Symmetry: C3
Subunit: 403 residues, 3 copies
């Protein structure tokens, strides 16, 4: 067949992507409760690259593809990854401008409130309809019939484990099967006089799993003293398949955070309440959902009993964060998170008071290239032996390039 | 080493490709004779993408590469494919303009009359010499020393099976080994006064398999009333390795088709005769060869006894097709195929009268983007229980983008 | 997220690469000592492609990636490779121009004197600092914490085997584990009046393996009669882990080569001395290191007893090469290598006199596209049965494109 110049063909195509290097080390003393989600890296060199292409195919049609490279070179003792790129997203977008509506069909990162919306977000295959007729307001309905589960491993509900009672692979939240996911969302962004108001409502029926419902409201000023306030409730009501088992509970999470910025300083204060004393519950579908703005620390919400994607235990946490930014370039800062998990089990496995301190540096070298580092210290008041405390420390150096 | 700008490097390069989505569902009632070639999709999302690059490397030399992505996301009950692209073709082309001759060497889609010439055509590694000294006439000689067999699965002769006699994997046409393939072809395209005449002659020796010979002639007018007439004979004579087994027969296929187009209407009428009553034979090497213009329906020639790439049974079929094209944009149409398979086996497995009706819609959204759909109904007069009939229905929705 | 035009994005990017086809056949008579490194190809079609991209990411920062395709289509009897591309190198380069210094971190081809610096060079992950403050002089320090070992197979020290004493997989140089590699180098290139002088010094500590030290000096005139002289010493001192085993010896290699070119003729003369009579030693880390300019022939230094990446036996070799270049386009030439291996083992396995003759053609079709061929004949005076000689012949046709 005929072939046209590559130079002509690329004119039709937009591109973006990410290149991320992490060097992670996570140590644990003997008494620490370990699990599939805590950082167990031993001086690993981790690379994650994604390149996204979007091509205007025909009038009102776009095709999108994402290639992903996800690899680790071991530091001490040691693999050196030999991997290629995989097609991580592949979809078609139809846009009818006359009614401000788009239909997105195929393998796509889901980007819902209960999944990670970043680099490593849950992917699935389905259809999404998005309407933007009302200025500031995005309305969406979606249906998903399969999930790219394997790539996520322990991030996905039902695929995480924890160590305890002579077993290394206790199932945090047992899921025998999963159905389609149907839902809808209303997401607002309104520029008001004093600042910007971002309310969201999300509803979703995940067949065989649960009915999920979430409401969030954020308000953010834009003047000297800038401040934000954000609150969220996420709950779910279990499907009968799980309800009949009597060892699960409906999910509830309440969260509130305030923050302030002035003269290069920033601080934040917040809290959250979630989980059940005696029964396994979940807040999100994958990892920490899109809840990053309402959490703090790095490792504490991965501790057994406190995970947001399946665990037993009632959690209450408060936190404060603060830092100073030199020259709008280098921010040095810290997080302190304190709280605990209440358990009804006689073992109280995962229970007790928990604390995390994190020292942070973030260096914005250019608008596209950011270097960062953290040192996280987590302390459990009750470890494997519950009458003794336990420490876990994690160090990360990261380079992050976006284009 | 030194590196030049990507922007300079791409000037040397031509590109083409295909993006195809299919949503297929194929149902079978209990009495239907199933096999490795009938459509057994259950609401599968199938993606096939190919991107071809050709670069002028030096005076008179081109290098070509094809990347292929071939993946399925399961609909009901469900995988979500995590696959990359593979190098499906990789070859060098030398062109001597002074004698209108080219030499093509390496891993290349074969594109012979006995293989599929489309997206999913048999690939092999070898050499091809093509001469175009005589206007309208292409002469070629070729030699192939290995085949990309695994990618083709049941499309390839010797790799198909059928269900029957308490067994799920009966071998349609047993091939213990295969040798090199040598052949030659003369392909004509002549613009005459009334229209265009396309005769072809193909000869090939496939060591350990058979000697293949095919002649085809097509004539196609170009005025109101436009019409085409095409006839073909394909035969083969088995190599001694198979001849000695006494359970195989030499292949013979005769085919004829006429078509007419007027005022947005089109119709076609044709027939074919192929196979042996009692012994296994073949017509093509892979799938349906390049015989698509001489067949109709979708699933009927995949029924056990009727496959063109290895089966037992003497087949006679007639068909008619027709449709109307609105606005040169949307064609609604239908196929009716009727005939049967004569078997000498006491079981008459695969035998009996067979029928297929297909309803079609084809929507040419742009010159490059085509949407299409079919609903196929196949009826066997003799099923697994031979004194009862059997139905098989297949629905496909397809989006096809070519560039 | 927002996406910019691909056409803009590529402006930031430099590219280079290689496309190589080899057709190799290596025959052995019954008495030949075979091993994991001799050419055992049977009319194999071998493809190796690499494409390298380097992008300016930010002020003073570059990111580099190499994609590799390494595949074989079998000739006689026969696979047809279905493989994609893998990320073979991935690294960041920081350059401070004020002090003529660069820091290179990540997965990178090592390119040290003890590894192949060509297409198939050892890759590892680590850090390199390179200083070019003194004109002509490059100073470097490096640290490597993991090796891409699997890709190299028998090229890597500790991963080669040989046939003998009723066993097919005798370990040439047994390595139970390997540590980090730290080293430094000083590499000079000085344009003097008469020509160019290229001295090198390399030092490296490979934990658990050995301390390596190498000095090389090359001198090359640039007038009628042009000539080169080059000498090298490479030695190593074994780490205690191997020293304690008493079956290994410290490495020593001495080499000298002279060459001359006049009126389209070229010739060279050289010699080398390396290895230990009774104990396993090595010269390089991977394949033949960067020693290609000090060797001749094709297969002789792969014979059991003579490998430069782990073997037992004391080797002494001399060689002469010569050829004529027609029109600065086609060189026809030959290599003759003669010597032997002294062994203290009662079997004298790998020992005896050894000879190689190679006939060569090299055709420079364009500056970027080179065709080449060789016919190599190797003769062992002592084969598997030591009182009988043994032959091994190897034919290669190659096409090589660089951009
Ligand atoms: C030459 C037409 C534009 C090509 C678009 C690329 C399709 C993935
Ligand atoms: C209406 C805003 C969401 C609910 C906030 C809950 C905070 C305790
Ligand atoms: C709107 C109040 C923000 C609270 C921030 C307090 C952090 C010390
Ligand atoms: C700042 C801490 C608030 C919540 C602590 C709960 C302690 C069990
Ligand atoms: C910069 C020269 C052209 C590059 C051709 C690409 C080779 C695959
Ligand atoms: C000469 C044309 C090919 C043979 C046609 C056979 C149709 C019955
Ligand atoms: C040349 C005759 C064409 C026959 C078409 C008939 C279909 C009804
Ligand atoms: C239109 C039908 C022609 C061939 C039918 C053969 C029936 C066994
Ligand atoms: C559009 C900015 C340049 C892109 C560089 C490519 C990164 C791998
Ligand atoms: C000083 C140059 C390296 C040593 C040469 C050894 C040649 C026998
Ligand atoms: C400097 C002397 C070069 C020696 C070359 C001799 C080859 C016959
Ligand atoms: C030209 C040959 C020099 C070295 C030969 C050594 C013979 C054992
Ligand atoms: Ca994730
Ligand atoms: Ca096929
Ligand atoms: Ca190598």
């Amino acid at each position: 067949g005929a072939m046209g110049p590559l130079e002509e063909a690329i004119k039709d195509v937009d591109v973006s992507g990410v290149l991320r290097y992490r060097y992670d080390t996570g140590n644990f003393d003997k008494n620490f409760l370990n699990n599939s989600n805590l950082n167990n890296s031993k001086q690993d060199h981790k690379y994650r690259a994604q390149v996204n292409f979007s091509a205007a195919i025909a009038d009102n049609f776009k095709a999108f593809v994402q290639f992903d490279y996800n690899a680790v070179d071991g530091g001490t003792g040691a693999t050196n990854a030999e991997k290629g790129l995989f097609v991580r997203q592949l979809y078609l977008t139809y846009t009818n401008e006359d009614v401000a509506t788009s239909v997105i069909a195929g393998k796509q990162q889901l980007n819902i409130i209960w999944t990670d919306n970043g680099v490593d977000g849950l992917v699935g295959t389905g259809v999404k309809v998005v309407n933007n007729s009302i200025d500031g307001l995005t309305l969406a309905a979606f249906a998903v019939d399969s999930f790219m589960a394997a790539e996520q491993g322990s991030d996905l509900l039902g695929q995480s484990t924890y160590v305890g009672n002579g077993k290394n692979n206790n199932d945090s939240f047992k899921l025998d099967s999963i159905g389609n996911l149907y839902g809808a969302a209303a997401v607002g962004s309104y520029d008001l006089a004093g600042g910007q108001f971002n309310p969201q409502l999300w509803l979703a029926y995940w067949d065989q799993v649960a009915f999920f419902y979430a409401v969030d409201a954020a308000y953010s000023t834009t003047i000297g003293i800038n401040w934000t306030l954000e609150g969220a409730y996420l709950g779910n009501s279990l499907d009968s398949e799980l309800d009949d088992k009597k060892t699960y509970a409906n999910g509830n999470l309440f969260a509130l955070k305030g923050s302030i910025e002035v003269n290069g300083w920033d601080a934040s204060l917040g809290g959250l309440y979630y989980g059940d004393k005696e029964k396994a519950s979940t807040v999100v579908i994958e990892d920490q959902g899109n809840l990053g703005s309402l959490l703090a620390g790095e490792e504490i919400f991965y501790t057994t009993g406190s995970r947001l994607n399946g665990d037993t235990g009632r959690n209450i946490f408060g936190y404060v964060t603060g830092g100073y930014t030199f020259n709008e370039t280098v921010r040095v800062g810290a997080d302190f998170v304190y709280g605990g998990t209440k358990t009804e089990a006689t073992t109280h496995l995962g229970g007790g008071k928990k604390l995390e301190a994190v020292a942070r540096v973030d260096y914005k070298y250019s608008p596209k290239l950011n270097f960062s580092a953290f040192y996280s210290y987590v302390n459990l008041d009750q470890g494997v032996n519950t009458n003794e405390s336990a420490d876990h420390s994690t160090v990360r150096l990261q380079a992050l390039y976006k284009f």
